[PDB]
Amino acid sequence: IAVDGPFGTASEDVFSYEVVMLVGAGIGVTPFASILKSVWYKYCNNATNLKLKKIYFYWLCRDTHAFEWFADLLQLLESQMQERNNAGFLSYNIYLTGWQKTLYGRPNWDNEFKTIASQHPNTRIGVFLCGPEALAETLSKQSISNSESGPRGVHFIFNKENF
Ligand code: NI
Ligand code: NI
Ligand code: NI
Ligand code: NI
Ligand code: NI
Ligand code: NI
Ligand code: NI
């Protein structure tokens, strides 16, 4: 059993939230490949657990060919989802940082958290990451700064995972 596999801790944590923000940068996108596959499998066969309803995926990429296989995986998943009546389950943004649209540059995280927040009031959002320690700081800060103690407040819970 792998942490990034169907019965791994990371996969279980991801499935415990109604909505999640998954961020994978560079080689850090690799674990998410197995996680996305397992989540799609569970969604189609796991009657006993129906918690996860929405995935916001962020891919920070420098070399587009090095992980060409990951892009194909995203299209594959996206296709299967549109098929079995579930397009909208996954929304992904790809950022080419070398210098479902693909953008050049890095995201404005403050803007991203606000948008997601406004779309899911009174929701506990799990935030996950596999990438540079700095990006972890940013996500942590944003997660806290964008959460609200109010009744309709949104909660961004950054989950540490041992990839
Ligand atoms: Ni194992
Ligand atoms: Ni496993
Ligand atoms: Ni378990
Ligand atoms: Ni090659
Ligand atoms: Ni350069
Ligand atoms: Ni709700
Ligand atoms: Ni609350």
Side-chain angles (χ1 to χ4, degrees), residues 1-36 38-50 52-81 83 86-100 102-132 134-136 138-140 142-163:
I1 288 177
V3 63
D4 66 331
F7 298 100
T9 293
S11 192
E12 281 159 31
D13 283 343
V14 168
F15 222 79
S16 65
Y17 296 90
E18 182 181 1
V19 182
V20 302
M21 288 177 63
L22 310 181
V23 183
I27 61 173
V29 81
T30 304
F32 289 106
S34 177
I35 293 179
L36 288 169
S38 65
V39 165
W40 180 228
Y41 177 89
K42 294 185 182 180
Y43 201 78
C44 295
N45 311 81
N46 278 24
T48 172
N49 198 311
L50 321 176
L52 220 203
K53 301 290 187 175
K54 178 68 175 183
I55 299 177
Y56 288 97
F57 193 86
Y58 293 82
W59 179 12
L60 305 187
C61 175
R62 313 194 73 69
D63 193 313
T64 79
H65 186 68
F67 300 103
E68 207 308 84
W69 62 271
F70 187 69
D72 296 337
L73 176 54
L74 282 176
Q75 307 179 81
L76 173 58
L77 290 169
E78 192 182 12
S79 173
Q80 300 293 306
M81 288 169 206
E83 285 174 50
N86 203 51
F89 177 36
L90 169 69
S91 291
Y92 63 83
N93 303 312
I94 304 176
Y95 294 83
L96 298 175
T97 67
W99 290 326
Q100 317 284 54
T102 296
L103 305 178
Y104 293 86
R106 290 173 168 278
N108 180 304
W109 291 113
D110 196 66
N111 291 173
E112 301 296 323
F113 281 75
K114 297 198 185 307
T115 293
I116 293 172
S118 68
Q119 296 168 171
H120 304 277
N122 192 196
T123 296
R124 192 153 169 281
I125 299 174
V127 181
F128 303 74
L129 167 70
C130 187
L135 185 51
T138 297
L139 298 181
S140 298
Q142 295 288 181
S143 298
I144 298 168
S145 54
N146 284 89
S147 290
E148 171 64 43
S149 297
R152 287 170 294 294
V154 172
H155 296 294
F156 292 94
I157 313 304
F158 187 117
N159 283 226
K160 187 71 164 296
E161 298 299 349
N162 302 305
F163 296 121

